[PDB]
Design a protein around this nucleic acid. Sequence first.
DNA 1: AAAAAAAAAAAAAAA
DNA 2: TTTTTTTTTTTTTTTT
Length: 132
Amino acid sequence: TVKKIEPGTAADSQQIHEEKLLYWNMAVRDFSILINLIKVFDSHPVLHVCLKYGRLFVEAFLKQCMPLLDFSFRKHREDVLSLLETFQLDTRLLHHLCGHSKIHQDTRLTQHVPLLKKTLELLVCRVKAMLT
DNA sequence: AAAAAAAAAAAAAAA
DNA sequence: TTTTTTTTTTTTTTTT
């Protein structure tokens, strides 16, 4: 479902802008609570399918969300700052999940860590870019 | 203690 | 002639 949402235009109207950004908001809040259910659960298939699909989730966040961050920035400043503080808490949580992958030394979990790490560096440097 | 499911690696085929 | 993607197999881990 997160593959489906496309970035519109800067010349797109305010209503479509606000509805798709609140759609992104409930998407990232569902991602955050889906990360929060992992801290009590075990059985490396679980954390492995997490490290699989959360990666392409943040790839969807790269390819579909940040053009909307580029288009609607000047007017919806409070909305995009709420979205970035919503994403920063799951950024630190994904840092914790990759650290949890390193401290257990599993061959299945250690495949999908460094791609997610370099996409974390890409998203934080793009946060620095949209801060400008 | 055995069976099933899932993932990863290797092979093969197509552009 | 070379690279990528899909399919199949094998192993490992979890459950009954």
